[PDB]
Symmetry: C3
Amino acid sequence: HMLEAKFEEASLFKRIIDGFKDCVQLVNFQCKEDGIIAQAVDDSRVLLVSLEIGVEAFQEYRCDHPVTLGMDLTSLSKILRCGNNTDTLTLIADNTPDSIILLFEDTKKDRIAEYSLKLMDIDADFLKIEELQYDSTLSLPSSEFSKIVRDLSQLSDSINIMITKETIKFVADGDIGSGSAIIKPFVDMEHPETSIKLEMDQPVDLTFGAKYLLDIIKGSSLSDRVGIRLSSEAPALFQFDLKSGFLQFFLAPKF
Amino acid sequence: HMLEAKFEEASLFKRIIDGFKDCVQLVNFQCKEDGIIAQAVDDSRVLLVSLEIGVEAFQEYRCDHPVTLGMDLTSLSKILRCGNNTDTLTLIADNTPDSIILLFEDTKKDRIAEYSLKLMDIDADFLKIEELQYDSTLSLPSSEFSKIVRDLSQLSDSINIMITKETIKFVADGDIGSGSAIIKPFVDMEHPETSIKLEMDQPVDLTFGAKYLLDIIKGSSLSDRVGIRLSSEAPALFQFDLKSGFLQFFLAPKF
Amino acid sequence: HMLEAKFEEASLFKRIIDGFKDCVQLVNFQCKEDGIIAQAVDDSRVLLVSLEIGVEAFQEYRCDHPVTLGMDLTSLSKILRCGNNTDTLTLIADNTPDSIILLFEDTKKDRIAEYSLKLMDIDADFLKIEELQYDSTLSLPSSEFSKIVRDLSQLSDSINIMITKETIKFVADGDIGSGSAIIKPFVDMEHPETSIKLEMDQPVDLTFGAKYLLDIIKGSSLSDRVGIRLSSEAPALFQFDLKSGFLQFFLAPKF
């Protein structure tokens, strides 16, 4: 009992985990003094999940020692289905820990639920694959992006994002036919968060697997907007902005 | 780009397809100058689905050429799950078409989704099996008819509709037991659409498969009332009245 | 047509059956002059379900003859999915019956649905295993008890209820980790039905199967509170208080 990180609402940490729990299985939660960060590469080694949770995301955070505690998402999510969404979730562990302790407590002092989670042993191959300059950079409503991905997934397992100047084009092409959703950058004032931005330095023609994109758009529940950075050189970066933190999805193109 | 039929709301065409998509698989959409009509016989050749969609059902309809464009329901329904229920769905095709183009556009000009559907090749065995005079003719609330069919389906796979004068009797008889729902014709004034009519010229004792009836009652979402015409000679006619059009289910009795 | 028991709402009898239909399969409904009682032991012979339905639970009850009519829950529940929740459900049978008749009728006289259920032949091994004195006796909100059982079921198939003085402790221990929910007896005044009582005569350390507890907590829909009596000698008694009646779950501990 030494780091005891504490969330205001247990739902918040649950929503964060639920955002990327489907695309991966094992995760290396590397928590330190300035907060918690984590990475997780899937089995096929084509999708990286990078997470950062700052101090301000907690209502009371402490960590007198850099502790790397990896664990299974399926096991972690099971314990996360025990709270009452508004309970006080406290992540407790000690120096060189065997298990992480999750403490659920409501506003009243009737319910005091304490859970233990046997920690996994994960290799420390941390990746830094974010580029300085991307060929194209765009940001759109997360709910809108989920719509495009889900609709095109009906047609084929290959969604081709094609970006030219002032033209963002999503195209799917399968056996039963094809589909094409085309959006253009604009500005709104009644609700400026529905706006679409585009900063193209060079035209982009990349192809991504539909299987992976469907898991990526599940982070729409964490942010209203999604930042997409496309490059012909490095994997694409799908970023969801959290309150004092972020959830990144690095996806490698096909072909 | 020559016929371009256009719906006010994309939901309407989706609801129509959803009304009969389960009981069949391939459909021959025979659209012409006065609107669109279609037929579909299942594999077992005991259930016919006849559809008619008049000009008034569209908000803007054109067709300078009688075009028969058949297609797969499963593939068609997939594309129909892309709209936003209130988008402008436009069915576009050309003379001697390879594929039918479905264009989704909302009120604003942000979303312009265009889909292509590879057309099937369906045989032109169109059937006209509607009789002049049926032994019995009745009409009841569609939601009420769905209740009777669903409840009796629990007991056995054979639902026997038995009609005598002023007595409409639905009977199921299986291994675990039996059930009998009996309704009588009457008139209401607070909401005359809940009334039950019956025009019996001759008593009817027909037996239908529960499997088929369950698919037939799925058209209750298209009309408040359902018209049933029973004959000992020809297949029974279950008819749902659309706004400027209809959805018919011709079902052959057992034994 | 001789006993014709009658419920005010068909939903009530449906909810009662739905309370214990999952943990067993065959049930011996032994109805008599003062009401209806029934017992059902599962295949593994470790869980007994005892039911009592008094006269006051019906809106109109009669029974001129003690009749034991056993039946299959699955078949009984099927027929129970036919009503409209507010219909007049009437259980009809005769002296030495072959089948039990279930009559559904609404407030209006349009719907008159009559169902027959072929009665099963069940052995008359009725059990009286309730003790006089139990080591511990407690009562808590049924919704709260369901929460504890469901959450701990995620961890292992063995939930250990551990009771000491003024301390009720639920513990699960599995491969991925463990969990512990600890509640203490108190009194509320805004809503005294959320209170927790405990009358310990002797400390209790019993282990129950999670499979069975999950079925037991399904009776939370019948009562706000659940009475639990634990004994080291006899099976534990989980009791849900009905309006003029009860639903009991006798569960044998492990090890």
